[PDB]
């Protein structure tokens, strides 16, 4: 059941639905410090993607999940099946891009996109700074197929930032361990070999572009890159936070920023 893989969950109520997408290695629980502050005003729809929960027996890695375009298509199917009208889409990490891709096809279904820790491409070119040289990609991949357990122990603190002991690193490690290792590797490869830069000018719905100032995976210049290239309205806010999952690791800072961008129009 594709429904089992997505694990769509709804909470809250209101005239507007907020759809929350998550990044690689985590799941919808990454939004645990945001949801309490939305449910009074919004219906909230959460879903799992990018291989999350694939240690569940009922999980099957459908063919559509071979590409980020397939995830974008699947998001559109979710919006259809849950009768979504003009959602506020909040995408962490690559789900910002699957949301953006989807919004080019059904802009009528998106009131806005709020991007958190988004990047259209991690690998550098001669002319584009994504934050990774080839050596960096190969070193981050590390033991992902040799020894999944070892890989997680190194990957999780690097991505989350701060220090290995933090609850956020523990949480990210927990969700990584709810991924089947083969799926983690294939999705990791999909992501690092995807290049979404060409889509940006086709995006027309308003984009609120939020990131940590100190994110190992997303140089500060990436927020500006997106801002300069999208085809509709946009705004940038770079937070004084570290790490790729600041909604989990620095909620005291990140949650009020997210709420302001959810609740208020540009501009
Ligand atoms: C694969 C991958 C990542 C690796 C490191 O940092 C953030 C990432 O987000 C992703 O989707
Ligand atoms: Na697949
Ligand atoms: Na379906
Ligand atoms: Na608004």
Numbering used by the authors: 3 to 269
Quoted passage from the original study:
Here we present the crystal structure of S. hermonthica intermediate KAI2 (ShKAI2iB), which has 98% sequence identity with ShKAI2i that has been reported to respond to karrikin but not to GR24 through complementation experiments. ShKAI2iB consisted of a core domain and a cap domain. A cavity was formed between the two domains, in common with other KAI2/D14 proteins reported12202122232425, and catalytic triad (Ser95-His246-Asp217) lied at the bottom of the cavity. Our results indicated a novel binding specificity in which ShKAI2iB bound karrikin but not SL, in agreement with the reported results of cross-species complementation assays of ShKAI2i.
To determine why ShKAI2iB exhibited a different binding specificity from KAI2 and D14s, we solved crystal structures of apo ShKAI2iB at 2.0-Å resolution and ShKAI2iB-KAR1 complex at 1.2-Å resolution. In the complex structure of ShKAI2iB-KAR1, KAR1 was embedded completely in the cavity, with the oxygen-bearing edge facing down, and thus, the carbonyl group of KAR1 pointing toward the bottom of the cavity. Carbonyl oxygen of KAR1 in the ShKAI2iB-KAR1 structure was able to form hydrogen bond with the hydroxyl group of Ser95 through a water molecule. This water molecule also formed hydrogen bonds with main-chain amide nitrogen atoms of Phe26 and Leu96, which acts as an oxyanion hole in catalytic activity of α/β hydrolase. On the other hand, the methyl group of KAR1 was embedded in the hydrophobic side consisting of Phe26, Leu142, Phe190, Ile193 and Phe194, and the pyran ring of KAR1 formed face-to-edge aromatic-dipole interactions and hydrophobic interactions with ShKAI2iB. Upon KAR1 binding, Phe194 moved 1 Å away from KAR1 binding site, creating a space to accommodate KAR1. Actually, S95A exhibited almost no heat change following the addition of KAR1 in the ITC experiment, indicating that Ser95 is vital for KAR1 binding, likely by stabilizing a water molecule in the vicinity. As a result of inward shift of helix αD1, the side chain of Leu142 will cause a steric clash with KAR1 if it takes the same orientation as that in the KAI2-KAR1 structure. Unexpectedly, the complexed structure of ShKAI2iB with KAR1 also has a closed cavity, indicating that conformational changes of the cap domain are required to enable KAR1 to access the cavity. In the structure of KAR1-bound ShKAI2iB, the cavity was closed and KAR1 was unable to be exposed to the solvent.
